[model samples]
Target chain A: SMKIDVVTIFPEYLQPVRQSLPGKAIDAGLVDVAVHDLRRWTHDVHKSVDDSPYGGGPGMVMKPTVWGDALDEICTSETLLVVPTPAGYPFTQETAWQWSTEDHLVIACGRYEGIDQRVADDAATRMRVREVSIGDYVLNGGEAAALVIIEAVLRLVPGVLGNASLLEGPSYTRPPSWRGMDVPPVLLSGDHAKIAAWRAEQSRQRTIERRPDLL
Target chain B: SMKIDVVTIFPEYLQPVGLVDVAVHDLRRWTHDVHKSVDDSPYGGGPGMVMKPTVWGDALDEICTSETLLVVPTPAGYPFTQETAWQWSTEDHLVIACGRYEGIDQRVADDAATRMRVREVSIGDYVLNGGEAAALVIIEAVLRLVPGVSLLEGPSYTRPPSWRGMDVPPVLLSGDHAKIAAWRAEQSRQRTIERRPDLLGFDSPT
Candidate 1:
């Protein structure tokens, strides 16, 4: 079994992680997850986790000490800390596969501008630390990205899927014909070899039509 | 207000979309079967179930307008990016169709294209349990870019000059504004070159 710890300001945003495949994995004892509020470690009057950026910026930066304290208690020797940020390396299927093999993962969700850089810089000394971006896009905070990363990584963990190509060809369901369309005569032919060839050809053709860059 | 609606079998997976002010509908709502089933086996026998076109078609018809933009999340779709989100963020109405199992029958997107703009978008190169995650990802990305929003493209630091042997870069603390600006630019440049050279006009080695 693997353990996942998510530190976030808005734990409500992460409730879905407990409602899907990750939820099922937890129920079956294949995965363990806990969501912690970043404010829990705050010792200040306002329980603030952010402050003005050091060099002056439009948004606030999450204080490092707050993250430091939360991480100190949650991470173990083998834990891999995942920081979700736009400035980080892209998260891909390969990343998911790699993380699935790890014994533990702690994902820190940074809101406002982002978590102080030192949080990751300092944590690197004790455990593996990876800063990853889900894609070449911007999000309001790391919670959304954390949700994406969690869903991506947890699904690949062993015994969870009990999975596929990047993208295959089109698929069809019951009732061969519908609304002036047919499920391509080949799929209904009932010839296993022919169906395989047809799907492979369509997969190639669709890849070319929709994503030639993938070629 | 920009309008967005998402249809999926697993609406719980999309609960976050509501936070962004988008509507999430259950695909099962459009089904008539006792099971409220939204999927069936592939036409030619395959490993997974394929979403039924009729159910998706019905759900989309009621939700979409002639001026709406339809987004279908699929691994087979074109890769979605910041630019795509920027363009989508300005649209008056957007509808996302999230498929589970193998995927929604292809005919659904094909039919919707004639009535409105349709894009089969993938959030990234990774595979997910379903399009619900992709929908949440794509929605959040687009929402942040929408007008009336304010937000980063960096490592940020706060007070407490030093913590656990790591100190705020001296340049950030230095009152020399010119030098600090130059240092930050170089830091952003070096960080980009090291972590995302592709964004700096270099092609991915893949």
Candidate 2:
């Protein structure tokens, strides 16, 4: 079993986790997840968690004090701290496989310009810290990216859907014929060998056609 | 005003989209079956299932308009980026079609493209269980760039002069505007080089 803790000001963003495979794993007791509100650690009247960047910038940065308070209390020696940021290393299937094996994970979701850089620098001394970016694009905050990270990671855990993290090519369902388009005859032939060959070729060709970078 | 609609079987995952101005629709609502079945085994027999094309087709036909940009999230789609989000942010309307299982039938995207501008986009190289999360991410990125929703990457601090044995950089507190700006620029450059050299504008070492 794995213990996953998510700290975010927008706890509602993490709610989607319960509607997916991660949610099922939790129900099965294969994983335990707790969503914490980063605001909970703040003492200010407005419960503010962000502040102006050190020198100057276009956006606000999550304050280090609040983050430190929350993280210091939640992290354990066995825990890995994962922070989602656009500037961090890209998160991939390989990363997911690695994270699935961890005993515990504490994911910190930072919004605005992102948490004070010092938080990552400081946390690195005490625990395994990974500042990962789910993709090239930026988002409203780390909350959605956290959801992406959680889904990808938990899907690889043993009891979860036994997943696939790569392009499998195009798929078609029943009613083989639809709106003047027909399912490839190779699929209907039912010859396992030929069908397998065609699907493989199609997967390869589709990747080349759609995502050559994957090559 | 930007009109955004997200259609997914896991509507719960997209609840956060409410934080922004948008609409969430359940794919099951478009299904005709008693089970509200929207997926079926792949035509050729595979381990996973496939979202029915007709189901997606029906949902899309009724949902899309000439001005709508249909954004489909899939692993096989083109890479999505800040630029793409910026472009989308300017669109009059966007309908993010969220796929599940192996994926929605290819024809759904193909057919929609004939009528409206269809963009098949992937958030990153990694794969996800479904498109709901991807949709949430896309919504966040795109909507934030829209006119009203208020406000990149950098170091930040708040109110505390020092804490936990760490002190603020002397330059940040120096209060000399020119010196502070220069230090921050230097720090930003160094940080990027250290953490994301790939982001720097330079030719990779051959």
Candidate 3:
């Protein structure tokens, strides 16, 4: 089973991790998910984990020491370290699929301006560090993105989803018809030859019509 | 008042449109916003837009259509139709965000596959198309990332706190106690500064 560890400031915000889709995956023993409090690594009176960037910026960047210790201890060579940021790679269905196949994932949920550059750089070497964006926009921290990634990837796991084929069809491709809507007659024609041709046409047609960049 | 007409199949999915922060701003008149349906006119065929690809196609094809069209079709334009398109397209753009089948369709599908295959496709065209919808998507996604607004972003905040599973870091920097203490103090000061920049300048008792 894959082991997923999340390092976050608000550990309470991560409770849903063990209860929702990811929770179910954990219950089924397909994966082991855990949330680690970033505060634990702070020896200060206030248990702070972030500071102003050395050069100065609009928001505070998570301190390198705090994240460095947590990352050094939690991450392994096999782990994928995910850092969610607006300036990162847009997280897509393709990325979710890629993550699902990983053996383990360690997500660092940054608040404010995000983790110090050093932390991200160090973690990148020891693990698969990726700056993932949920969409074209940003979020409060990497936690939400972590949840999104967990939910998306877990569904792709072998036993997590009840039916593997459920991932297939429909939004997977622009169905000729949806919700009592009909797939193009060509799809329902019962011709394997036609169906194959139609699917390729549909994928190209749909992707071109919807997300042309995917084409 | 800027107008935003949403062309969506499930218009009801957008019922919550008014509740979003962007919509709330519109209601407060921080920005004038409106919504129009794309159900009428055009070819009236196909599974999605009734208009032939040409009708909607042409609407989006014109270079100066953004100035004339009442409704802007996002994701149907080329080069300039990504999420940030609206951010750059309008002087005072009001987003008309929508969630429908064709509503969220990619521009490539309409332009390359459909239009290239058939010369007669009447696809929509417009330059200054409202990026409002794309803007809203970006706003919601980015607003949550802002520090102070984290709690209001989603349901993750209400979850249970994890127990002691890892050890805290040793003193931030041991060799230089004074610098380390200063750094710790600076972190606290910066946290307050970043989290509540407005409150930093409050006058204190002498």
Candidate 4:
């Protein structure tokens, strides 16, 4: 079972994580997930885990010490540390598949203008740190992005999905087709030879038209 | 009031438009912000609003021809049109906020992407309607950046502390250093802000 640990300021907002698909995955023993509050580790007398950026920016940058401590305690050799940020690489189906193979996943959700760059840089050296973006837009916080990645990767684990065929199809599948769009007549005609050729062609065409950059 | 229109497949997901300080200054109203079914229109039927390119493109571009007009309709032209030109000409600039699956089609995105270069380039990780809310946030930050704006009675226009079920801790209103220091720490000691340690990096918070 894959284990995911989320570090967030508002763990209550993440209540949906324990009640939704991730919750279902956990109930089925397909995954184990935990959410941690960063405030507890913050040792400052003012309890400030963040402060004004050293460069005199408009918004505050999260202090590295608190984040570093959180990561130090939570990270494991098998843990794939996922940092959700606007500046991160766009999260895609490929990322989900890559993460599903991991034994443990640690997610860091940042808010405000952004997190301290140092936390991201440091986590990279110790763990399989990856910056993931949900789409080509911005969210008020990273909680939503963390949820998306968790759900996407969780469903990919062997027993998490009810219908394995459902996962076999769709955009990431061999030949993605629905409605009048057949997976090339060869796929249905039971001609394995032609079906393979058609599948490769369709995959290339669909990926190119939709996400050419992925190629 | 800014008339903001959002074309989303999951319209119900759009959060409620909460009132902010700047929202009071700019009359913000939502228009045609309803979720339409994916199969509402078909392609190549001459004026039929098809999904992927036509329905989405027209919605984002504001292109509507009369039902009686019978001309050879283009299959997939550009997403942005003369209406966008007029939108740019008048007012500050209409923020055309895109949503999920908004740019699945190549032709539609090519047009919108080109226009985006000419407009403000505020790209982020996730797609929401034009960053009207985020822009509003930056506006607030910029306003606070101005010398006297922070000292003004600006907090009055902000929602009353009752929304959070507490006044700004009596210490802020009062003039006690030690008490204020303790109260400030207590007031700001929030889980949400703490988990998002990066939020502490902002210089604006005194």
Error of 4 at A157 (Å): 1.6
Segments in model 3 whose C-alpha atoms lie over 4 Å from true places: A22-28, A89-98, A124-128, A161-199, B1-139, B142-206
Instruction: Please report the candidate that would top TM-score against the real structure.
Output: 1
For residues A109-173, what per-residue lDDT tens digits would candidate 4 score against the true structure? Answer: 87666666666666776678887655434455677667667656765677663323011011111
- Residue A38 error for model 4, in Å? 1.8
Clashing pairs in 1: none
TM-score of each: 0.94, 0.91, 0.49, 0.46
| Each candidate's interface RMSD | 1.7, 2.1, 13.7, 14.1
Mind sharing the TM-score for model 1?
0.94
Task: DockQ for candidate 1, please give it.
Answer: 0.71
Query: What lDDT tens digits, residue by residue, belong to model 1 across residues A129-165?
Result: 9999888888888888887777777767766653434
List candidate 2 segments past 4 Å from native: A19-24, A161-166, B18-21, B150-152, B201-206
| DockQ for all candidate structures vs. native | 0.71, 0.61, 0.05, 0.04
* Deviation in Å, model 4, residue B206 alpha carbon: 47
- What is residue A167's positional error in candidate 2, in angstroms? 4.0
Residue B165 lDDT in model 4? Answer: 35
Model 2: how far residue A23 lies from native, Å? 7.3
Residue-by-residue lDDT tens digits, candidate 1, B55-141: 888998999999989999987888898889989988888899888788988889888988899999888888787888888888888
Model 4 misplacement above 4 A: A22-24, A161-215, B1-206
User: Per-residue lDDT tens digits of candidate 2, residues A96-177?
Assistant: 9899888899999988778877787889988999988888787777888888888888878877644652356777788878
Correct interface contacts retained, every candidate: 0.83, 0.70, 0.03, 0.01
